[PDB]
Automatic annotation (TrEMBL), chain A:
<protein>
    <submittedName>
        <fullName>Uncharacterized protein</fullName>
    </submittedName>
</protein>
TrEMBL record, chains D, E:
<feature type="binding site">
    <location>
        <position position="222"/>
    </location>
    <ligand>
        <name>GDP 2</name>
    </ligand>
</feature>
<feature type="binding site">
    <location>
        <position position="226"/>
    </location>
    <ligand>
        <name>GDP 1</name>
    </ligand>
</feature>
<feature type="domain" description="Tubulin/FtsZ 2-layer sandwich">
    <location>
        <begin position="246"/>
        <end position="383"/>
    </location>
</feature>
<feature type="binding site">
    <location>
        <position position="142"/>
    </location>
    <ligand>
        <name>GDP 2</name>
    </ligand>
</feature>
<feature type="binding site">
    <location>
        <position position="144"/>
    </location>
    <ligand>
        <name>GDP 3</name>
    </ligand>
</feature>
<dbReference type="Pfam" id="PF00091">
    <property type="entry name" value="Tubulin"/>
</dbReference>
<feature type="binding site">
    <location>
        <position position="11"/>
    </location>
    <ligand>
        <name>GDP 3</name>
    </ligand>
</feature>
<dbReference type="GO" id="GO:0003924">
    <property type="term" value="F:GTPase activity"/>
</dbReference>
<dbReference type="Pfam" id="PF03953">
    <property type="entry name" value="Tubulin_C"/>
</dbReference>
Amino acid sequence: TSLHMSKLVPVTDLSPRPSFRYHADTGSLDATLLPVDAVPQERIGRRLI
Amino acid sequence: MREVISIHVGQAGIQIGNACWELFCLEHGIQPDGQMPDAFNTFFSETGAGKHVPRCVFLDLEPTVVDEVRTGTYRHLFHPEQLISGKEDAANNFARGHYTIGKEIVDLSLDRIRKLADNCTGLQGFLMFNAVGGGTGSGLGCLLLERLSVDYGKKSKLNFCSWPSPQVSTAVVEPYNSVLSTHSLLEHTDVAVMLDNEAIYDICRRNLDIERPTYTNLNRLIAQVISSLTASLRFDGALNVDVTEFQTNLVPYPRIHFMLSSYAPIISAEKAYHEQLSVAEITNSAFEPASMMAKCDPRHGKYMACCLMYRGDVVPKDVNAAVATIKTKRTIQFVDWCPTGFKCGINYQPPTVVPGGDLAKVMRAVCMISNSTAIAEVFSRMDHKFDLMYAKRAFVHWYVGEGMEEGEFSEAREDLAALEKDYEEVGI
Amino acid sequence: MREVISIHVGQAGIQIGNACWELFCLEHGIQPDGQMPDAFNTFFSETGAGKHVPRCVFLDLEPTVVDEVRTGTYRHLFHPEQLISGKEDAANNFARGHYTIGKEIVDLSLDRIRKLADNCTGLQGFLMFNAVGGGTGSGLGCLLLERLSVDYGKKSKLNFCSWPSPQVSTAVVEPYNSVLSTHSLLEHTDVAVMLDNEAIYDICRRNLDIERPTYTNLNRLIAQVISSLTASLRFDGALNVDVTEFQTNLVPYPRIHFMLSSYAPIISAEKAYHEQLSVAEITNSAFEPASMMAKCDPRHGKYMACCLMYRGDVVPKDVNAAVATIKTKRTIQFVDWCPTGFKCGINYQPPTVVPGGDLAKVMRAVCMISNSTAIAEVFSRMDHKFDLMYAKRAFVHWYVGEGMEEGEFSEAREDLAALEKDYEEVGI
Amino acid sequence: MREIVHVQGGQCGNQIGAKFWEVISDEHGIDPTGTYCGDSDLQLERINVFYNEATGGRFVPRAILMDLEPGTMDSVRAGPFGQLFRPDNFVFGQTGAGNNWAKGHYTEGAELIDSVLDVVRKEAEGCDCLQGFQITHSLGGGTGSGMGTLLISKVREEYPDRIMETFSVFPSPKVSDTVVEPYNATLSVHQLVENADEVQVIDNEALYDICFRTLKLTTPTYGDLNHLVSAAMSGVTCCLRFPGQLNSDLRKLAVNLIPFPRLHFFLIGFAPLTSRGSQQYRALSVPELTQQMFDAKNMMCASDPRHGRYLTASAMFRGRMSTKEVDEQMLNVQNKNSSYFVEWIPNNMKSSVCDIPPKGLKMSVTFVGNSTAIQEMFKRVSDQFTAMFRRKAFLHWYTGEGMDEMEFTEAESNMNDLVSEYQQYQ
Amino acid sequence: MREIVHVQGGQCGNQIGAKFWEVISDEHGIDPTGTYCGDSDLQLERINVFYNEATGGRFVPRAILMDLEPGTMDSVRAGPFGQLFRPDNFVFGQTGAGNNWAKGHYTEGAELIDSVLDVVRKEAEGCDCLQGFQITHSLGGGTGSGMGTLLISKVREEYPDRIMETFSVFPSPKVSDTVVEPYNATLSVHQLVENADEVQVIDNEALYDICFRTLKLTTPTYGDLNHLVSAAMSGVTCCLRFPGQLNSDLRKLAVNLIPFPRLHFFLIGFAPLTSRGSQQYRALSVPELTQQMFDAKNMMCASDPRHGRYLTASAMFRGRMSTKEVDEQMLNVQNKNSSYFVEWIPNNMKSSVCDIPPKGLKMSVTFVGNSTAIQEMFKRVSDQFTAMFRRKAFLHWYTGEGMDEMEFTEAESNMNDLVSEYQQYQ
Ligand SMILES: Nc1nc2c(ncn2[C@@H]2O[C@H](COP(=O)(O)OP(=O)(O)OP(=O)(O)O)[C@@H](O)[C@H]2O)c(=O)[nH]1
Ligand SMILES: Nc1nc2c(ncn2[C@@H]2O[C@H](COP(=O)(O)OP(=O)(O)OP(=O)(O)O)[C@@H](O)[C@H]2O)c(=O)[nH]1
Ligand SMILES: Nc1nc2c(ncn2[C@@H]2O[C@H](COP(=O)(O)OP(=O)(O)O)[C@@H](O)[C@H]2O)c(=O)[nH]1
Ligand SMILES: Nc1nc2c(ncn2[C@@H]2O[C@H](COP(=O)(O)OP(=O)(O)O)[C@@H](O)[C@H]2O)c(=O)[nH]1
Ligand SMILES: [Mg+2]
Ligand SMILES: [Mg+2]
């Protein structure tokens, strides 16, 4: 049997199968405080001398 | 689980599908002998010791192209009865491929299609590729649809016509072959996309700056279009747009199911170094009239629904900004009963390129399927040409003496005339 | 312990057993000397310190094949007195094989099967491999059923008959032999199936895709279907049923004991590559009307009882799932008075592959015996061929002067005709 | 003490005892080599119920594994834990009754029945007073349905005053093997209804239905279906060997579930039956497990109880529980689902809390429900019989070996009056 | 105690509802593997509002997840904070509703609604006494608009007394994919008005307004939109989960925000919302927090509230804050913007204090207003829909699926009187 000895539960470790390539979970750029989660960005300006 | 069955009738279908499954093998990491060194289930079938077999029937009445596949490197990829052939060609006749010589092959085409479609329930539909201007692409291309409509009724039927050019023909009976088959795919095809050969000829000359592309180079762009069209089925994305979404958002009436195609960017390594492929400019190049893949000019036609297949690292807020720019543009025009006219879908896998082909590496792409009232001219150049064959019996005896009766030329002509009236009354 | 004895009447019967016993030697791992380097006890006895001898008797009148078995490589596999040969051919005469040159060889073969049967208790029955059109296979076949039925009146009999085929017959007087054989076959055998030659020829033409095989290629298929039928008697399985269950589950009336057969898959080395042979796949293919082994289309007939033997790594759920999809299918038609028409037995030990033959190593397989009302047209054409031949005494003068009176021909006519009326009244 | 004498008939019966004896032996802490391990008083406190001392400290099951083909108990003996039985209790048939009711019951099996009768009264009389006999078999095949009910028939006469505990595996509606299903099923059930005190109905694809839909088993074999019913036997006889706050035995079930003697056919549920994806996600308490008990998806009989009214109902609760919530949790299922119970019996209930659960689990339940939902199963084996019987199907073996046309007609009369009585009580 | 059965419909509701569970696990101190971390009494003393213990000390959400195609719920399940749900709570579709209301409602959604009703009855009846339902869905798609609101029609009828709140995203006017937008919008609303007693609208183009103008996000993905509405749905149900000086559940909001049962559509806003470059520059005081709240640039629905008139409004305050500053700033905005408030209801505004702010914030408010300004967007999708039906737009795939033409004109007839009812209170 694929169940356990006295437990009535399956005992066969795991036999899974994912569907897609499955990444890019849309890592949100808003933490719990929701500011912007700033990283160093592009300034868009002229030559600052 | 889910799968889609490819159909390829005619030698144009065989060698287009050769480039298509060359792109599908290279996308999923599948060697031509089958073994990969579960997103593949949409096209390939898992079998045995981890090998994969394509779900694509290969129909052609002459073995001059299909046993070349049987002796080429893609022979241990397909099953031998997955590639089927008779003895004798149709020789550019609708009446040959529909009344005389298509019987001994179609009875085993349905025998293979029953055991390719019973593999897993939840099948999406069929993707037939045909050469409408040819003999067995029109003839057996017609005859296979009454069999699929009466057997597999409710399932979706996609058709990709290799549309004859307005001036380039490479055949003189192709107005007979095209009229007799477009009459029948009008009510037997759910979604039909026109793919004119000159429309791909000038798009390689312009956007690739390649001056000698050929049939195989044409088949690479067609393969890139169909791969991006099914890329939602085979890969994850923000907005998944499967096969049923093509119907419900593009075709408004059961008769008006002819749609144009466009693919942008299609850029060689000379220019991909110099251009940045922003979402705004890949959809301006997708919407420009020179980028239509049907030689169907849309300045004098009215768009009503455009599907946008973004394929790559595309954030959807650039999509919503770009389609807004398309709305504000006045050179194009939309019909009065479609203020909403876009169905955008996002896929996250970038489109790969073949090593040694004519496409450079690309970060995002757009595959457009658009329904417009501009299709009246590509059926009116049809109307004027087929009338002047019909005036004094041009090549009629090669049809009437081979199964059909004289009079279906009139029945197919008046049905396409009703298609012209239908396109005229909708556009007003 | 338990055993079953095979008898081989006719050249066709001995050549069927020739591929049978070389297949069983592979299955039980015995060399052609009989000595291994207790599941074999149903086909092999014991001899000395390790030898086994088959419980088979090779009975012909022609010595050109029986002595050729003795001279060949399988000499000491068989006990030399079990191979009984006569003097001269019956030569396509039911009269010679039953009356004149049969009386000196039936008594000798009866002694050999007497000494082969009393060795142990627990016998299930007999397996008679024979043809129908041949004079020896019909003549000595008739007298052997006549003698075995009257003294072994409670033991089953398995008449595997190589019935004449529709398009080819490769004999002239063989419709005479077929009607005379069924004159006595009805009242003396317990289970009989029809194995028409060109049904098997068609099987190996579009499954093996070999177009000029030989007799040994068909006898390997018959060896495979006997081995898959009796694998329950030998190897342990989850659901095991054997000869006693056949005699009580597939022949609902005492006089209908004619069945069809099929196998699935029959695939070559290259055709094992490109599909996984699922249980549902090898049930749909076995139920294909072109896959039957009697040129006996069940499309215009109604199935009456069915039995399938799954061999290999089969699991008990998809045997129920494949049967469920067969019930849902409308092309396969059942009979009204049998709502539960399915029997099966599953086994673990897969069918072996002969090294240098034509099969391929398969994980699972399906044997088939199915009773239906579709053998009515199989024997109705033996009626029609016998009509215009028995109009004005074609070849009758040498059957009537050489052992029987005129009138046994007429008696064989209503005996086969009453089988046609029996087949008609069951369905309605 | 009170002792159960186990008899297994047929290939189904020998396999279903080749899983029940394992799940009851490890519950008693018994090795395959018969030696106890577990240092607990409660496991050995009632071991004479299902075992006999061997004057060596090792315990032998009081079972009799028996049919007419030797391949079934050779595979039991070769398999794990199959050594525990005596070769003396094993009785052998060599020719075999193949899917045949008549020659199992009359000609072949009666030759063997005088020797397996010897071994069943030796396990019976060997103690001071037995509780009852447990016979597990199936109603589809020949040796387990034809001669299986022959021993049900005869143990009625020498032992009338003791209970007759039987598990029967009824034929499957949509996909059934063993082509003569209703001829074996209906010709056995009449001997099974006036010679058995209570019978439990187990159906094959309903065991599958628990596997695919609630256990989420990707690969169930016969062993996975066999565990589901082996837990049903273990729960129904747990309170005989193991103490509890409220005792219950086989006659405890019999006098409370049968109001009228001709109807003793019982539905079985088992709880909890968790898909192991959600085993670590499911709370385990009485107010969540009672609706898993009263559930169509947890039914190893393939009859929807929503197409009928519960005539009487009971539940063998097990585990470290609260024996207030033993009973208002079924008070809830009665006063909400009022239409799903019969009206002229107020208070349709019996809880039976037993203290010791199966190992690891803190709660478990076998459910015994006498309901008119089995009407659909008896009608379905009736019209499958009569559609065959109207055109004389598969019958010339049955008549030719010691039966006649007359016996099948009362086989359908006492099949049809079971349906007619259940409409009288509907 | 008081529990909210959370419900997700469509691929939108799966991916903005999943965001709701880790923003509610974060306030409740929940490890993504289910354990507790943070040793605070008042986090867990109201944990039954959204979670159930699973006899191992772990908490499983009371979430029911629907989609007719398994792709997006694979993305929810196998992602971070997404294995917390029970796999049985997921229900799979196979064919998929292709952005059309007809197939999601009648043909395909009927065979899937029977499993959803079983599991939502499993969760609701299992606990002692419910409080209400939360419904997260979309009106642009097919499965979220058809099957989701068919669920809304069925769950109205077994449980009529309780509160039925929805967070629904409506089709955006300016940006528009999925060309049958006015059909899926109108066919949802015309029977969404009668089977839902509380509906709160979020516009995606307003979600682009709040992320461009106030947050100044350079490249806002969908995760920012999912999370901002997650802060909105967390602030409404704050008082059910954490104690406050001024207590108010969403039943109290339902009484206090609608004067008539026909109008029940609400605006949602959230405050404070500043960039990182403005994170430690803005003062977090009650006068600043309420003037940022009354802003069309702060709104999450694309109807300008200045163009209409606020009938009744409410502000669920969050954080330890001085309390008459809550009152007097509400009188400040009422007595200053006197023209934007209706005159026949004195003091249109409601406040409550939830004493526990969201993590990392000292003060925060969610804003549930009921303005007649929303007739801008109901009428503008009515003008789009009447441009569709006047020339037979995509009609065959809205009439061939078992439904007819007359409920399209019925859908408009009982929607333009919603615009007219708001017109005569304007
Ligand atoms: N798009 C595309 N069209 C092709 C290709 N090769 C051939 N064609 C088209 O095929 C058309 C001629 O059709 P045929 O040569 O008659 O081929 P067919 O359709 O199979 O018909 P038969 O040859 O009679 O069997 C030409 O007008 C070409 O445009 C190709 O590689 N790509
Ligand atoms: N399948 C199969 N059929 C065979 C084989 N050999 C002969 N046959 C069939 O037998 C027929 C010829 O008659 P035989 O069976 O050889 O005649 P016989 O039984 O030997 O009787 P006699 O010729 O009088 O000795 C042909 O029509 C074949 O179809 C064989 O090896 N395999
Ligand atoms: N529960 C269970 N059922 C089985 C098993 N094997 C077969 N069956 C069912 O029982 C029927 C065959 O009964 P069988 O054991 O052959 O009866 P017997 O011939 O009298 O011994 C089949 O239709 C199966 O559906 C098993 O191991 N366990
Ligand atoms: N608020 C919100 N709206 C979304 C999201 N994803 C898609 N949408 C909107 O939903 C519509 C697409 O419908 P969709 O749910 O994908 O189709 P469905 O799966 O058949 O219900 C589009 O108009 C989008 O604007 C999301 O994550 N959040
Ligand atoms: Mg061609
Ligand atoms: Mg011969």
